[model samples]
Target chain A: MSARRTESDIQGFHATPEFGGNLQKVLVDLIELSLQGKQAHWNVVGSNFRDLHLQLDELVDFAREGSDTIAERMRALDAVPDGRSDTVAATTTLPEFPAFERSTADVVDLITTRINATVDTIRRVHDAVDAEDPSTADLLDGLIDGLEKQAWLIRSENRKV
Target chain B: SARRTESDIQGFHATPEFGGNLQKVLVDLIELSLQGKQAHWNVVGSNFRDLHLQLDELVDFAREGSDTIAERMRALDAVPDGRSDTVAATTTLPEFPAFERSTADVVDLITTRINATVDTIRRVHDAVDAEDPSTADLLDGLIDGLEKQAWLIRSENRKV
Candidate 1:
């Protein structure tokens, strides 16, 4: 299985073609999630506008850094990460978020679905990357924990009286 | 870390001198994470919910972000030392105000402390770079993240 790989290393650490492949897909999700967040950020308008606006920026940060972290590691591994639109468009399997409008409630419902699903997205990547490169797995662990926390912040909007 | 010698990897290495400073920065960051959450739970203000959630973002940076740093320290053979006793003893943080009730006051302090912590992280970059550029590079990226967080808060206000 390892025969196809070149057996190169960085700082005594080795990576596989599969690890890079898994990470590029994760990068696709991260970049798309960020754009989805921005779409909601720019279009969100209602009584909850102030809080919602700020929340999206935080969401973008969560997605942005997670993507940046993966891309950095990929580069460190000498892999060319395709974060371009063509890449995300071709690679991302997450549902496309329709242009959001209405109250914070509507966007929360939509984003909650995606952010929670992202845990699974990350898990699939982790299952592959962790076995070989725990470095990337560390990146995934923090990212999964963050999106869940972000989802919690979003879900707080749903608290019952 | 005692394990640090001339190098840690290709062109990267660690030294106890460098590790000691790195340890200080990581503990400082973790302490700030918890303290921010403390403020997040306690803050009261005009935009109460807005401030509340905004503070939560800062909290998570310290919350999970500390683990990312600690793992790297482990790679360099340094114990994470994230226990409460460690932060309590070694943290350079000024007494975090137990409670504050206004966005103005809370934002002011949050921004101040973030920049202070950024300063703490930055002061050690060259030392880490001398022994380990990859480690220094990680701090550089995290510093960029912190600056962005500071910007959002600094820009959180709008002129009437």
Candidate 2:
């Protein structure tokens, strides 16, 4: 049988891998964030545990939604979004979340750092991708809005009263 | 906190004129999609099922066009405001009526709206082509798709 190939509905932009590559790279990190957000949601324990727990709920949902958007945009461009466990661990730039129960403070700091790291990857590839496909860049804009907002809220949990 | 990840620096940002033209097309497509769905639901008379499905196809086309235009705006560092108010104020499409309509009226009304949308896209093509041929290229595709839908819907009421 001849090898099957899927074509992009969009034209001209898919000639290079730079556009789809950046999107896939970004997709991997967003997937990791979703997984990490859930882990933090389930495992954190402290006086403010309940509040942080609920906050992670939103963060997880946002990450999940963001990943789906990116992946679909990938398919729109005929780029496959690989979210398998091995793929994520290999390609993701996000720092790992710790295992088991942890302090509320620790969750705040670690997750904050992770969020910023994800933002770094997003911003780094944005200009390059924007040059090729603005549709992908626009999706990245929405993801940044949600991710930064969550980072701000999560990081502020440690602030002085 | 010190710096935004969404930096202003880019390869090339959209000029105000460029962004405005795109915004117009975006809102018009959104309005067209909304109107298509309304027509889809309120359609009456013969060929109801066929017309209903065709209306859905038109809705999908308009919605996808709106999304593509909006995303292109965002890529150029311009925000795409698709809020109900923005679409209501900016769209050039004629308002679809509230109540049910016969198939003939639906065909005529939707054809008018599609032609209007095509005109808007055509009007902006020269300027878009001058400033950003990439965007103009996109508009060309939108016109091809929209025009075909217009022909298909208009032919429903035509003979030979």
Candidate 3:
């Protein structure tokens, strides 16, 4: 008799729907966040020029790093990484940017809104992954944890100021 | 205070708990950088135009700081950190605060975090100093840049 294949032998199976959806969300968000960082980098000013400028640079770098990781995760799930700016613009749930002339406070408000929105989306995705895919749940759990901490730090900074 | 362990200084390689701290700090730096840009791009009022231009310059500097710190983490033989997973697992920084209502508030918030970060860096630095001077040195470098940025922001706020 011919040897039979076992369940473990299925190598071409893609990630389940839950995992794929979560990965898609993360990938798109990463791209959108990177753009946000760049926006901040290009616009920050005042007497605090030197300090704020440096801080924006750091944000951009982080966004860039996030973009890379999100893309990698998408590939691991056997999905094509989304790279078009127009696609990110269409798919991202982030808020629209305010008009060109805005106050420092206005700018902060804009970024904060997006951050909160992104955090909520990520958490929801994590819960979905947890219910459907244990392995992806583990992966997402780590990512959610980091995002929460980051949001917390930003909140703390806002409170302290 | 509790006595420090060897892994505290050298870092817990396998455990996310230990190596994660530095990674958290980097994330904070990244977040701060983005916030700075928002302020730079949109800030208006009496100095609307001039201040707007200057903010862009500041954002550039912040980006450099982030790059240096992120690269350093890699130098330690750690993966270039900051996946949502790694950041969520490791970061200890507080949540992003509600949006500021004024320029003064923005300056204040940024400076406040810079101070807090300095404190965390010092604590980490002391631990690493006791166990590994090299890591301590790296932490110190980050602290130095943070302090400089804080000073500049504070000075600018004082003028306004």
Candidate 4:
């Protein structure tokens, strides 16, 4: 299945097997996160509906950005990124976001949990990616920083501090 | 002239031309956040609440992007200048209007501003990629995010 590529690495760098697979893992989760975050954005209801609505949009935007960042970085490293809906459904390890209306608090908990899980996956593969490509590792660092910030923003909605 | 930081990344040091590009983006992002906040404060109308909140999100995005780009510059030994006067002079964004603006007005104005910022990112992408693909990858994500923000803002005023 890997032989169909038309162009050699347009960039000078090539991804090792481990590096390529790890990036795919990150990419699929981010794509799923964006889809699920949008679901929450539309379905959320409560006293804090407007606040949660805006916050969820921010999360969705970050997930979108993260997914593209990983995918383009993968291409730069000569790895094909798989982000098809079926591929994400099959490959993502994150828990499902629910359908239909949900309370603002429930959405917060659900999203925060998934957000942390995504961060964990990025951290899990960080060392290996860094070893294979330090520059790519740097890209992951920015992603983790952005994702963690989104998690904090979402979780803080329910927090006293 | 910008101060220079010591480059820590072995086998790759940024050139002066590269630092200038990063500075260009940093200033635009700083001005973008400021302009977004100004709209947040002055925007009025039935759509005020949603637009206000959205502006905050845009401001946050610009602020975070500026910080990330500046740090990347410093990591590559390029000092970033984000002073008020610097952004005032360096940003290519058109001047956002003063005082109060309707929600409809903000939708058009802010979308244009976001597009302007996107233009800067796109303009600098090739040069940055030539010197550093990692940074260009960073800009790619920012472009995705900024364009999404623009789309959301534009939809507010869409007739259909």
Q: What is candidate 1's TM-score against the reference?
A: 0.50
Q: Which portions of model 4 miss their true places by more than 4 Å?
A: A1-161, B1-11
Query: Candidate 1 vs candidate 4: which has greater lDDT?
Result: 4
Which has the greatest TM-score? 2
TM-score of chain B of 4: 0.93
For candidate 2, the lDDT comes to: 0.82
Candidate that would win on DockQ: 1
Q: Candidate 2, residues B101-137: lDDT per residue as tens digits?
A: 9998898888878877876787887798789888987
RMSD versus native structure for model 4: 15.0
> What is the C-alpha lDDT profile of model 4 across B66-87, one tens digit per residue?
9888877755557799999999
Per-residue lDDT, model 4, residue B110, is 98
In candidate 1, which residue ranges exceed 4 Å CA deviation?
Answer: A1-12, B1-48, B51-160
lDDT of each: 0.78, 0.82, 0.60, 0.84
Q: Write the per-residue lDDT of candidate 2 for residues A61-126, one digit (tens) a residue.
A: 999998887776665444667889999998899888888999999999999998899888899999
| Native-referenced Cα lDDT, model 3 | 0.60
- Look at candidate 3 and tell me the lDDT of residue A151: 42
Residues forming the 10-long window of minimal summed lDDT in candidate 3 chain B: B42-51
Ranking, lDDT, top scorer first: 4, 2, 1, 3
lDDT of 3 by residue, A24-106 (tens): 78767766766875675567544334433454455556556666776676677786777688888888877766445444444
For model 3 the TM-score comes to 0.46
Candidate 2 ranges beyond 4 A from true positions = A1-15, B1-160
Report the lDDT tens digits of candidate 1 across residue range A15-57.
Answer: 5788778888888888989988898888877766777788888
